[PDB]
Amino acid sequence: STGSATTTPIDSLDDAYITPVQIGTPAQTLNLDFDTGSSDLWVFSSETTASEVDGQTIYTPSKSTTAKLLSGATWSISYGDGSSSSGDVYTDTVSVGGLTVTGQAVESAKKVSSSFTEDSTIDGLLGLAFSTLNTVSPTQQKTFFDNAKASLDSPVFTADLGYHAPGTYNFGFIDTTAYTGSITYTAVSTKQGFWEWTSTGYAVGSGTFKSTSIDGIADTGTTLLYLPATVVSAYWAQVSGAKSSSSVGGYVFPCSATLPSFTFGVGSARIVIPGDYIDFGPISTGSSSCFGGIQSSAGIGINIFGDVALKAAFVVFNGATTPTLGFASK
């Protein structure tokens, strides 16, 4: 089997991407944030504290003839940005782009943090990291991809995120018309539960490529590109007037600037992020100071190849017995 679904930016800055997902019988379609950095499929629901729902579409398990409460199961997750959610668990039928999994764990939120409430466009998350990170207790549950992968034509999914435009998540096949050149594959460590890999280096604009190992994670659920402070300082030094602002929480730059590209290495291959992918717009409405899309990872503990990086590539998440990642230009 295969599936193919369009993913759409939630706003004009590409702050996140949402993908429609059918849950239950009859189908209830929710728009979920596909997140290769986590491993829970959780949704706003009829069980979510009413004051914490503000415009989201909810899953109502009592209206699904295939929903079954997973007895005794609870979940609770906290994300790297400080947001969180928790609740109980159903199993139900879940379909993405024509690919159907029966008995998928659907984690129904009883509580969500304010950042989720305040984002009316995101109805939940669909985790695509390794199932070892799933938070369901006392019996850990499998991700949608883990449940589907034996049925797929090939045990892979691909992320093709757009810049200020829709893109595609495919399951089970590699669309050879969706990229240019070849796909370069690179080794993955699953020891932390992530799609963790080592970039071979970087360049700023037309500058010389610096060969240096940068261990990080491919994370579709993180907006920005978080890299070591040395790398980030080298990038922003090429933008007149850019500075790290402690009050804002990262590098900012004059909105009148023209940003240089940023290149990262995948083996001997090179992925070029155009400068305008690095512009996240005014820090507050009407400001002429703009927020940068490349930020230091120093306070995180891990480097993160988030959407800023991934949207410059066609990315293969190869879930073979030994997982690998692939990157192509597009």
Side-chain angles (χ1 to χ4, degrees), residues 1-62 64-67 69-109 112-141 143-148 150-190 192-242 244-330:
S1 61
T2 64
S4 180
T6 299
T7 191
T8 302
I10 64 164
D11 64 22
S12 65
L13 298 174
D14 299 348
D15 281 318
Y17 298 78
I18 51 170
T19 309
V21 178
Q22 282 71 49
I23 309 175
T25 311
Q28 300 177 40
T29 298
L30 276 64
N31 297 328
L32 304 188
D33 185 350
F34 283 24
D35 180 11
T36 63
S38 68
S39 307
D40 288 50
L41 193 175
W42 74 260
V43 297
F44 279 79
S45 75
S46 57
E47 302 176 332
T48 308
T49 299
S51 65
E52 299 181 349
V53 185
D54 186 4
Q56 295 81 10
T57 295
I58 62 167
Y59 171 57
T60 301
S62 67
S64 174
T65 57
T66 42
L69 185 67
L70 186 61
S71 181
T74 59
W75 63 280
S76 181
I77 192 163
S78 304
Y79 297 98
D81 62 349
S83 64
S84 64
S85 53
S86 62
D88 58 11
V89 186
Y90 293 80
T91 58
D92 210 341
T93 302
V94 173
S95 299
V96 176
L99 169 66
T100 300
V101 168
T102 58
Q104 174 63 46
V106 176
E107 303 173 32
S108 164
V112 304
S113 64
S114 59
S115 62
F116 289 114
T117 299
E118 291 159 5
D119 185 356
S120 67
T121 70
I122 293 175
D123 302 324
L125 269 64
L126 189 151
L128 293 167
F130 293 88
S131 294
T132 54
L133 297 182
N134 177 266
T135 78
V136 176
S137 181
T139 306
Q140 189 171 67
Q141 300 295 303
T143 69
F144 176 80
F145 178 56
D146 216 334
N147 282 323
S151 303
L152 294 177
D153 291 357
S154 179
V156 305
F157 68 91
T158 65
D160 181 7
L161 302 179
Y163 167 65
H164 294 178
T168 305
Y169 282 102
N170 290 330
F171 292 82
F173 71 106
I174 286 163
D175 178 358
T176 62
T177 74
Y179 57 86
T180 64
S182 76
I183 306 176
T184 294
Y185 290 86
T186 197
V188 165
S189 173
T190 65
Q192 297 190 83
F194 301 124
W195 294 91
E196 187 173 2
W197 65 290
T198 301
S199 172
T200 48
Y202 69 96
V204 176
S206 58
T208 64
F209 187 84
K210 175 71 168 181
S211 291
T212 184
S213 294
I214 303 171
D215 182 292
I217 67 169
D219 186 1
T220 59
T222 291
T223 313
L224 305 188
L225 173 54
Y226 294 90
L227 292 172
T230 50
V231 178
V232 174
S233 180
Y235 178 79
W236 289 108
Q238 298 306 311
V239 181
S240 278
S244 182
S245 167
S246 55
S247 63
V248 174
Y251 283 88
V252 300
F253 67 94
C255 295
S256 61
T258 296
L259 295 180
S261 64
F262 184 89
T263 299
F264 63 96
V266 182
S268 62
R270 305 290 179 254
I271 300 294
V272 180
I273 305 170
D276 61 5
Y277 290 27
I278 299 159
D279 183 357
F280 281 76
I283 60 173
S284 289
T285 302
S287 176
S288 69
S289 183
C290 275
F291 196 67
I294 296 178
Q295 298 292 348
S296 179
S297 64
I300 297 175
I302 198 163
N303 300 304
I304 307 174
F305 294 86
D307 297 335
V308 163
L310 303 182
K311 77 178 72 180
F314 177 90
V315 187
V316 181
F317 294 81
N318 168 29
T321 301
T322 297
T324 65
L325 280 165
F327 292 82
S329 293
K330 65 188 183 189

